[PDB]
Symmetry: C2
Subunit: 252 residues, 2 copies
Amino acid sequence: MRKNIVAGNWKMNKTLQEGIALAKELNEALANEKPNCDVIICTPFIHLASVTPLVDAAKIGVGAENCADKASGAYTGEVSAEMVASTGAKYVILGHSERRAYYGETVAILEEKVKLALANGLTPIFCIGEVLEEREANKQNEVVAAQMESVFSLSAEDFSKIILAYEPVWAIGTGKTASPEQAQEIHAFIRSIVADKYGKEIADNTSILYGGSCKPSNAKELFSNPDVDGGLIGGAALKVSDFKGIIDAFNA
Amino acid sequence: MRKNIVAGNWKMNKTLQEGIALAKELNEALANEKPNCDVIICTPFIHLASVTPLVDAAKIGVGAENCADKASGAYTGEVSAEMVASTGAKYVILGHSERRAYYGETVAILEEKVKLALANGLTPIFCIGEVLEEREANKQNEVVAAQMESVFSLSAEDFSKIILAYEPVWAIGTGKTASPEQAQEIHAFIRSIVADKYGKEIADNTSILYGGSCKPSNAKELFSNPDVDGGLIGGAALKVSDFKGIIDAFNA
């Protein structure tokens, strides 16, 4: 059955000590219940080895926010998929809109990063999404379809190992908001192109997370949509009560 | 007095466990002597917090291999200078030839990264160097002078806090080698442009490390040059006996 998932993307926030304390605080806050979803914290590279021993692995997984497009070697400053896996992390965000925008990540580079993540037993959280000019031109479907080429070269077995996350990049800094109806529409389209590629069973087993603004006050309405399987959380990931309030949206 | 320094750049090598074991092995190998130089290990981001407690801080410092061009925030995958400092690391490599070549690092980006490193108490190891086509055209001096603009916007007080490293990028994969005489020539030129900017005292206090191929068999000849103050070590950084053999070149 398709997994519901709440994954926090800490982005470039938290010193070593703050990230350790945040992970401890989140673990304490979830101690008295079994969340009705998978929960993941995606941290900067510096925290991974320090936070994996601090969280109940039956409730909280750990992810990196990126990995390199090579397995190892003369790539000063880069951190490989094998390195990420060696910390105990089981997930990696790939293709985040900030890396596409600022760091030149292309379809080909992301295709290689996904392969390396899978070769090291990591679950990619593969991000897609269109910018304001694309949304205003009604090009969102063709944009996300083109971005999915990084993962549609995978075999069916390999594709079944990945999570997708949709980012309405057009809603950043513009005052705009993707309504729950708009989120459902594009999530349904994404699932349909997965089905076109691999058939309905693979598509129906893919978790497609909403990566726009997600807060305790809007999470239940977003997640109640049939094609929205949880969230890749930004700002609310950095405050325990807000992150837990989103996790609570899946309570039975 | 100007510092002699042997700094190892691990590049994108070593799982978490391998880097911990390598740091322990190096610490054990240096236990019975006080090296006659500063010694630094520059590791991937994943190791920093795990390796700083394992090395004798009076003998071995720890560095990162890069840091972000922003202080904090919505830069998924990037690790900030503040994050690096919070691990106990005191150094950061900036401007390595691999990042200039592969990751689009410009004069302006590197100027900002150096400022952020200094704002967080880190000592930059700022790398410069020309490629084969530039060396064959005898343009090495103008190339390194242009690259130094990222740091010549610093005040004299701030510039005094940085280390330089010269990379003969033209010697990678071409069968070529920068002779000790060639290393001395370009190191002397680099020191002369530091003197042109800040005066002779600041220039005479700047450590300028050789970043080409450095092994136990060539380290004494390289380091005996008056303008070569040690090395930024590549392959030999990953084997204790080789790294120690380079450190031994400074023995009295």
